[PDB]
Coordinates of C-alpha atoms in Angstrom, one line a residue:
Chain U
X20 CA 0.0 0.1 0.1
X21 CA 1.2 3.5 -0.6
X22 CA -1.3 6.4 -0.4
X23 CA -2.0 5.1 3.4
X24 CA 1.5 5.9 3.8
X25 CA 0.7 9.7 3.0
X26 CA -2.3 9.7 5.2
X27 CA 0.0 8.4 8.1
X28 CA 2.1 10.8 7.7
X29 CA -0.7 13.4 7.8
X30 CA -2.2 12.0 10.9
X31 CA 1.2 12.1 12.6
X32 CA 1.3 15.5 11.7
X33 CA -2.0 16.1 13.3
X34 CA -1.0 14.4 16.7
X35 CA 2.1 16.8 16.6
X36 CA -0.3 19.8 16.2
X37 CA -2.3 18.6 19.0
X38 CA 0.0 17.6 21.5
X39 CA 1.7 21.0 20.9
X40 CA -1.7 22.6 21.3
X41 CA -2.2 20.8 25.1
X42 CA 1.2 21.9 26.2
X43 CA 0.6 25.3 25.2
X44 CA -2.8 25.6 26.9
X45 CA -1.7 23.7 30.2
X46 CA 1.0 26.2 30.4
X47 CA -0.9 29.6 29.5
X48 CA -4.0 28.3 31.4
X49 CA -1.6 27.8 34.6
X50 CA -0.1 31.1 34.2
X51 CA -3.4 33.1 33.8
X52 CA -4.4 31.3 36.8
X53 CA -1.6 32.0 39.0
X54 CA -1.7 35.8 38.2
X55 CA -5.4 35.9 39.0
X56 CA -4.6 34.0 42.2
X57 CA -1.9 36.7 43.1
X58 CA -4.1 39.6 42.1
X59 CA -6.9 38.2 44.8
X60 CA -4.2 37.4 47.3
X61 CA -2.8 41.2 46.7
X62 CA -6.6 42.5 47.1
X63 CA -7.2 40.7 50.4
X64 CA -4.0 42.5 51.8
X65 CA -5.1 45.8 50.4
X66 CA -8.8 45.0 52.0
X67 CA -7.1 44.3 55.5
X68 CA -5.4 47.4 55.2
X69 CA -8.6 49.5 54.2
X70 CA -10.6 47.7 56.9
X71 CA -7.7 48.8 59.6
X72 CA -7.7 52.3 58.5
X73 CA -11.6 52.5 58.3
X74 CA -11.6 50.9 61.7
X75 CA -9.5 53.6 63.1
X76 CA -11.3 56.4 61.5
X77 CA -14.4 55.2 62.7
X78 CA -13.1 55.2 66.6
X79 CA -12.0 58.6 66.4
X80 CA -15.5 59.8 65.5
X81 CA -16.7 57.9 68.7
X82 CA -14.1 59.2 70.7
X83 CA -15.2 62.9 69.3
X84 CA -18.9 62.1 70.2
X85 CA -17.9 61.2 73.6
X86 CA -15.9 64.4 73.9
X87 CA -18.8 66.7 72.5
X88 CA -21.4 64.8 74.8
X89 CA -19.1 65.6 77.9
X90 CA -18.7 69.1 77.0
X91 CA -22.1 70.0 76.4
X92 CA -22.8 68.3 79.8
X93 CA -20.8 70.8 81.4
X94 CA -23.5 73.6 81.3
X95 CA -26.6 70.9 81.1
Chain Q
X21 CA -0.1 -8.8 2.0
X22 CA 2.3 -5.7 0.8
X23 CA 1.6 -4.6 3.8
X24 CA -2.0 -3.6 3.5
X25 CA -3.6 -4.5 6.8
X26 CA -0.5 -3.5 9.2
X27 CA -1.2 0.2 7.7
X28 CA -4.8 -0.2 8.3
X29 CA -4.1 -1.4 11.7
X30 CA -2.0 1.6 12.5
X31 CA -4.2 4.0 10.7
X32 CA -6.8 3.1 13.4
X33 CA -4.5 3.3 16.3
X34 CA -3.7 7.1 15.2
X35 CA -7.7 7.9 14.6
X36 CA -7.7 6.7 18.5
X37 CA -4.8 9.0 19.7
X38 CA -6.3 11.9 17.8
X39 CA -9.6 11.6 19.4
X40 CA -8.2 10.9 22.9
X41 CA -6.4 14.2 22.5
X42 CA -9.3 16.3 21.4
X43 CA -11.0 14.9 24.2
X44 CA -8.2 16.0 26.4
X45 CA -8.2 19.5 24.7
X46 CA -12.0 20.0 25.4
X47 CA -11.5 18.8 29.1
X48 CA -8.9 21.0 29.6
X49 CA -10.4 24.2 28.3
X50 CA -13.7 23.3 30.1
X51 CA -11.9 23.0 33.4
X52 CA -9.8 25.8 32.7
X53 CA -12.7 28.2 32.0
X54 CA -14.3 27.1 35.0
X55 CA -11.4 28.1 37.5
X56 CA -10.5 31.4 35.8
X57 CA -14.5 32.4 36.0
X58 CA -14.3 32.1 39.9
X59 CA -11.1 33.5 40.4
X60 CA -12.3 36.6 38.4
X61 CA -15.4 36.7 40.5
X62 CA -13.7 36.7 43.6
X63 CA -11.6 39.5 42.3
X64 CA -14.7 41.6 41.6
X65 CA -16.2 41.0 45.1
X66 CA -12.8 42.0 46.7
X67 CA -12.8 45.0 44.7
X68 CA -16.5 45.3 45.8
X69 CA -15.5 45.3 49.4
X70 CA -12.5 47.7 48.8
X71 CA -14.9 50.2 47.4
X72 CA -17.5 49.8 50.4
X73 CA -14.5 50.4 52.7
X74 CA -13.6 53.6 51.0
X75 CA -17.3 54.5 51.3
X76 CA -17.4 54.2 55.1
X77 CA -13.6 55.7 55.7
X78 CA -15.2 58.9 53.7
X79 CA -18.4 58.8 55.8
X80 CA -16.2 58.5 59.0
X81 CA -14.2 61.4 57.8
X82 CA -17.2 63.7 57.1
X83 CA -18.4 62.6 60.4
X84 CA -15.4 63.7 62.3
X85 CA -15.4 66.8 60.4
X86 CA -18.9 67.4 61.6
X87 CA -18.2 66.5 65.0
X88 CA -15.0 68.6 65.3
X89 CA -16.7 71.4 63.9
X90 CA -19.5 71.0 66.5
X91 CA -17.1 70.9 69.2
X92 CA -14.9 74.0 68.2
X93 CA -18.0 76.2 67.8
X94 CA -19.9 75.3 70.9
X95 CA -16.4 76.4 72.8
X96 CA -16.4 79.3 70.9
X97 CA -19.9 80.4 71.6
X98 CA -19.2 79.7 75.4
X99 CA -15.9 81.9 75.5
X100 CA -18.3 84.8 75.2

């Protein structure tokens, strides 16, 4: 047989294309997944900061609220 | 004979390998889309929570501004 030989050949070329595709997708997918993971981790650290900063700001007003009540009670 | 069946045999094996390879590709991209989608959703929820923290930070700042302006003036009015 010949023509089978050329199909063989083409199938092997096809197989090579597909295995190359898997490796590419595997590696590119893993990359995208890892940078997304890094970003959410970065966002978690940013959040904790903002929550700290925000906790401090809110307590400041509570403190001021009490200081104001105290002042006005000095003539109540 | 001339080698006809042996080539038909291999051709079949190569058909099977190709089909296995395309099933892998499908299963990989389906799995990947699934993970990426969940990560992107987490990102935007985290971003939403960052946005709300700034809103409340701003609100506390305006509140302090008000409180401090009240304090300053009530004393001002009393020093007369």
